[PDB]
Enzyme design. Structure first.
Site, PDB file in Angstrom:
ATOM      1  N   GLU A 101      -6.539  48.762  -1.635  1.00  0.00           N
ATOM      2  CA  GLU A 101      -6.157  49.825  -2.031  1.00  0.00           C
ATOM      3  C   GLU A 101      -7.480  50.283  -3.287  1.00  0.00           C
ATOM      4  O   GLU A 101      -7.029  49.837  -4.503  1.00  0.00           O
ATOM      5  CB  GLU A 101      -5.056  50.300  -2.480  1.00  0.00           C
ATOM      6  CG  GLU A 101      -4.789  51.551  -3.247  1.00  0.00           C
ATOM      7  CD  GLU A 101      -3.327  51.723  -3.431  1.00  0.00           C
ATOM      8  OE1 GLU A 101      -2.356  51.688  -2.825  1.00  0.00           O
ATOM      9  OE2 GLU A 101      -2.809  51.911  -4.980  1.00  0.00           O
TER      10      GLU A 101
ATOM     11  N   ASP B 226      -4.190  46.123  -4.961  1.00  0.00           N
ATOM     12  CA  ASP B 226      -4.607  47.344  -5.569  1.00  0.00           C
ATOM     13  C   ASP B 226      -5.603  47.140  -6.542  1.00  0.00           C
ATOM     14  O   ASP B 226      -5.521  46.777  -7.664  1.00  0.00           O
ATOM     15  CB  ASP B 226      -3.501  48.029  -6.093  1.00  0.00           C
ATOM     16  CG  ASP B 226      -2.354  48.181  -5.193  1.00  0.00           C
ATOM     17  OD1 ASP B 226      -2.564  48.296  -3.971  1.00  0.00           O
ATOM     18  OD2 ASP B 226      -1.213  48.520  -5.837  1.00  0.00           O
TER      19      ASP B 226
ATOM     20  N   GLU C 180      -1.693  42.792   0.377  1.00  0.00           N
ATOM     21  CA  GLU C 180      -1.968  44.069  -0.483  1.00  0.00           C
ATOM     22  C   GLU C 180      -2.771  43.759  -1.849  1.00  0.00           C
ATOM     23  O   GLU C 180      -2.245  42.785  -2.789  1.00  0.00           O
ATOM     24  CB  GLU C 180      -1.034  44.813  -0.820  1.00  0.00           C
ATOM     25  CG  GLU C 180      -0.567  45.410   0.771  1.00  0.00           C
ATOM     26  CD  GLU C 180       0.687  46.177   0.776  1.00  0.00           C
ATOM     27  OE1 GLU C 180       0.836  46.669  -0.502  1.00  0.00           O
ATOM     28  OE2 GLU C 180       1.256  46.257   1.635  1.00  0.00           O
TER      29      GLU C 180
ATOM     30  N   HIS D 152      -0.515  47.323 -10.456  1.00  0.00           N
ATOM     31  CA  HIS D 152       0.097  48.443  -9.918  1.00  0.00           C
ATOM     32  C   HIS D 152      -0.408  49.740 -11.158  1.00  0.00           C
ATOM     33  O   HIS D 152       0.238  49.975 -12.076  1.00  0.00           O
ATOM     34  CB  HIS D 152       1.504  48.619  -9.833  1.00  0.00           C
ATOM     35  CG  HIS D 152       2.184  49.322  -9.143  1.00  0.00           C
ATOM     36  ND1 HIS D 152       3.634  49.657  -8.845  1.00  0.00           N
ATOM     37  CD2 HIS D 152       1.823  50.291  -8.235  1.00  0.00           C
ATOM     38  CE1 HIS D 152       3.713  50.717  -8.207  1.00  0.00           C
ATOM     39  NE2 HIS D 152       2.842  51.192  -7.714  1.00  0.00           N
TER      40      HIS D 152
ATOM     41  N   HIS E 104       4.076  43.502   0.780  1.00  0.00           N
ATOM     42  CA  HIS E 104       3.848  44.728  -0.269  1.00  0.00           C
ATOM     43  C   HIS E 104       3.355  44.515  -1.409  1.00  0.00           C
ATOM     44  O   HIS E 104       4.235  43.490  -2.152  1.00  0.00           O
ATOM     45  CB  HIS E 104       4.885  45.595   0.241  1.00  0.00           C
ATOM     46  CG  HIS E 104       5.092  46.880  -0.738  1.00  0.00           C
ATOM     47  ND1 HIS E 104       5.665  46.937  -2.083  1.00  0.00           N
ATOM     48  CD2 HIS E 104       4.328  47.975  -0.828  1.00  0.00           C
ATOM     49  CE1 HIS E 104       5.522  48.250  -2.123  1.00  0.00           C
ATOM     50  NE2 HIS E 104       4.515  48.871  -1.530  1.00  0.00           N
ATOM     51  N   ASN E 105       2.590  45.218  -1.953  1.00  0.00           N
ATOM     52  CA  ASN E 105       2.104  44.760  -3.293  1.00  0.00           C
ATOM     53  C   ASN E 105       2.163  43.362  -3.639  1.00  0.00           C
ATOM     54  O   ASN E 105       2.740  43.022  -4.538  1.00  0.00           O
ATOM     55  CB  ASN E 105       2.768  45.617  -4.371  1.00  0.00           C
ATOM     56  CG  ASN E 105       2.250  47.207  -4.391  1.00  0.00           C
ATOM     57  OD1 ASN E 105       2.876  47.851  -5.163  1.00  0.00           O
ATOM     58  ND2 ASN E 105       1.188  47.593  -3.719  1.00  0.00           N
TER      59      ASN E 105
END
Length: 505
Positions: free
Chosen positions: A186, A139, A137, A152, A107-108
């Protein structure tokens, strides 16, 4: 060695096997291997391979015998490991759809610490991949001078370049495993910076990238074997804000919103489409839909991610998710804890390749299995596990003393339990508990046994010394040494627990 080795219990068990003799004859060893070690391969061949492989003394090794030396050497070896050595290699069917496997997921990934003000680093991707992680991941946001960045959004988290992150990923993608890595994007970039993203993807990843679909694959997700040495992208795909350049690169992991379940009653989410659930929603769906969810996860990949409140980058238990067929359970890999412990413990299985084949009852479209409301089925096969925590040796100690071993079963609701031993006062070098525990495990295929060593402290809370997590079907019987891991999941050079394991049907 009169201090180093000279383990009372190692003598007690050697004699239990040698008898009056001072060595182990191939005949006495094979008996030990089958009766004690419950070896399915117990015969002359196994015992001879262990003598040639672990006997230090050459004379006994010549006269086909086994001294206390080779006995202990074997018991501390890969062969005496409580974690099935046969399982440290890829041994599972790697030809089933991606949805039939539990995938090591981050995650992230970019983050090294918390979710609001902490640092982002390519190192975070490297560390994750080196730990076998397959789903990363990214972003993506617009950055200064037409160069996309990763961080983030709307927080003080440090920023890094999209291109740098891709170079790091390119370098370490298949270091720990040849099986496919999924890059979940993302995207918040403008149409111009998305083109930059696409160009970097193709220029940096090159042929590693799965740019086109596989011929023949049309009804289901391809298999991990089919996508070896390949990287696939996950994200929004053109339904028509998104440039053809990027959209055309989303082949098997089209990001979609969850529109409810449906089962094979013709009407629903495609195999190439993937939905995401917060830990909270995932749990709700598991409590509400049960086997509907499990069935859904036979054909479609499902991603789970930490609840929004977890800004400390804390982790949730991955087990209940796995019990529901959820395969891409994303955890904060930067956060040490029993969650990551059980997490990497599951992925130590199948050669650490990041893909672990789900139990057949979870790979059946019509299964009526439900982890939250158990019924009779092939999943219900209760065993009685007995673990004797005999001794511990050379316990890591960096702030050390007073140990206690906690043994826990992680699995379905019923099986989740724990037991602990008394604290041995000031003794990490040779603590001896000789204490047996007994757990009843109704659904062994979804269970994992975790050995945990703490440093007792009445007023300061116990300090974590080391741990090890072993999936049920990888748990070896008889006398075995549990090799402890540190908080970062790195194996302590000489920290172990001598134990005896017994599974009865």
């Amino acid at each position: 060695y009169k201090m180093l080795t000279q383990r009372a219990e190692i003598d007690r068990a050697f004699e239990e096997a040698a008898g009056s003799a001072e060595t182990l004859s191939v005949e006495r060893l094979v008996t030990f291997l089958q009766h004690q070690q419950r070896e399915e391969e117990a015969g002359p061949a196994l015992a001879l391979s262990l003598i040639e492989r672990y006997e230090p003394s050459e004379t006994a090794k010549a006269q086909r015998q086994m001294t206390k030396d080779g006995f202990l050497m074997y018991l501390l070896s890969a062969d005496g490991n409580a974690f099935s050595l046969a399982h440290r290699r890829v041994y599972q069917d790697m030809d089933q759809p991606l949805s039939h496997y539990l995938v090591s997921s981050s995650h992230n990934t970019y983050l090294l610490e918390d979710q609001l003000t902490g640092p982002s680093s390519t190192e975070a991707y490297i560390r994750a991949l080196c730990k076998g992680c397959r789903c990363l991941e990214l972003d993506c946001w617009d950055g200064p001078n037409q160069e996309p960045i990763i961080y983030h959004g709307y927080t003080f988290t440090s920023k890094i370049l999209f291109c740098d992150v891709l170079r790091a990923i390119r370098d370490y993608a298949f270091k720990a495993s040849p099986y496919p890595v999924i890059l979940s994007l993302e995207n918040h970039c403008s149409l111009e910076q998305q083109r930059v993203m696409a160009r970097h993807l193709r220029a940096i990843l090159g042929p590693i990238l799965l740019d086109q679909p596989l011929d023949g694959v049309t009804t289901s997700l391809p298999s991990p074997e089919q996508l070896k040495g390949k990287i696939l992208l996950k994200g929004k795909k053109l339904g028509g804000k998104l440039v053809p350049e990027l959209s055309d690169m989303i082949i098997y992991c089209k990001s979609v919103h969850f529109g409810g379940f449906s089962s094979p009653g013709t009407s629903g989410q495609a195999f190439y489409e993937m939905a995401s659930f917060s830990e909270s929603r995932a749990l709700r769906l598991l409590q509400e839909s049960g086997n509907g969810f499990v069935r859904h996860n036979v054909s479609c990949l499902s991603r789970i991610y930490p609840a929004g409140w977890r800004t400390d980058s804390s982790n949730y238990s991955p087990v209940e998710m796995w019990n529901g067929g959820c395969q891409i359970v994303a955890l904060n890999f930067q956060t040490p804890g029993p969650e990551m412990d059980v997490y990497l413990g599951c992925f130590q299985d199948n050669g650490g390749c990041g893909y672990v084949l789900k139990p057949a009852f979870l790979r059946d479209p019509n299964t009526t299995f439900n982890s939250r409301a158990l019924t009779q089925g092939p999943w219900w096969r209760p065993e009685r596990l007995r673990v004797r925590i005999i001794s511990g040796q050379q316990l890591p100690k960096v702030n050390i003393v007073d140990p206690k071993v906690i043994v826990e079963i992680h699995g379905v609701g019923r099986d989740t339990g724990s037991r602990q031993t008394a604290v041995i006062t000031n003794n990490g070098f040779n603590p001896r508990w000789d204490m047996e525990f007994e757990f009843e495990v109704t659904v062994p295929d979804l269970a994992l046994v975790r050995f945990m060593v703490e440093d007792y402290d009445s007023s300061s809370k116990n300090d974590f010394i080391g741990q090890s997590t072993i999936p049920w079907n990888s748990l070896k019987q008889g006398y075995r040494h549990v090799h402890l891991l540190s908080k970062n999941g790195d194996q302590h050079p000489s920290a172990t627990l001598f134990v005896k394991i017994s599974i009865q049907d």
